[PDB]
Design a protein around this nucleic acid. Structure first.
Lengths: 144, 147
RNA sequence: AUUAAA
RNA sequence: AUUAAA
């Protein structure tokens, strides 16, 4: 069986990071019941268009309060991921070099991941409300 | 991702071929490469395939209750919810002998017949509007599936 | 338990 | 011009 993979995991050179991630990744709607669906949407952060604006700070605010309040008022969970999301950039490269699925996202572009867990008709409406409020953060020029 | 792929090809070339599963998995990860923007705020496409309960209600035909006379009640729902709803899956066609239609010819046009009988709600709008339209459509479509 | 739209 | 949440 595939447990051959376990023999590869221990014996593979740690210098191959993406292969060791893929091998460890390989370890393996009804509306009338109306149980809780989960959704997610990855929203790009326009650093190409606004390179002089720091979005990560405007989004989080003091001790993350502004992101917490948006999460609370939209009833969603938001996570800032991608290249440039971490505060320590030397740690961000070594964690990207670490190439663990948890930190794998750093290879991608700076973006927000909004998650919502609710019954389906509510879960879609909550995500739509969150997408309307988050653009005020991602659009400095929202006047006109 | 301009940084990710050159490291895969570097691993591909430098890796020991004796690792067959690991080398196969990085090749599968390479074949993949051969996400919303709200400041440009262009239209996305959302869809949700909503099964309708024939296992729970085998005696109730929903597809007729959904369409109505000449599809008036379904188009009225598509108008008020501003979505495109298409009934697909096994039993969607009224003629079930002409169903299992081709399907060994294998056209993705007809591939949906292998899926269970459902309703695919598609909505085309900007992301904030698209997600809010879908949520409203799922609100109203319950009323057809709860006799 | 006759609803058939795109 | 600062903000650093999970």
């Amino acid at each position: 069986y595939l447990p051959e993979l376990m023999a590869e995991k221990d014996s593979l050179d740690p210098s191959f990071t993406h292969a060791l991630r893929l091998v460890n990744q390989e370890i393996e709607i009804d509306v009338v019941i109306n149980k809780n669906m989960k959704l997610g949407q990855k929203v790009l952060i326009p650093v190409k268009q606004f390179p002089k604006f720091n979005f990560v700070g405007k989004l989080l605010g003091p001790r993350g309060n502004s992101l917490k309040r948006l999460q609370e008022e939209t009833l969603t969970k938001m996570s800032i991921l991608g290249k440039g999301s971490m505060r320590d950039k030397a740690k961000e490269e070594e964690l990207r070099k670490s190439g663990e699925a948890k930190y794998f996202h750093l290879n991608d572009d700076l973006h927000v991941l909004i998650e919502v867990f609710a019954p389906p008709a509510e879960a879609y409406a909550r995500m739509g409300h969150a997408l309307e409020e988050i653009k005020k953060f991602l659009i400095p020029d929202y006047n006109d």
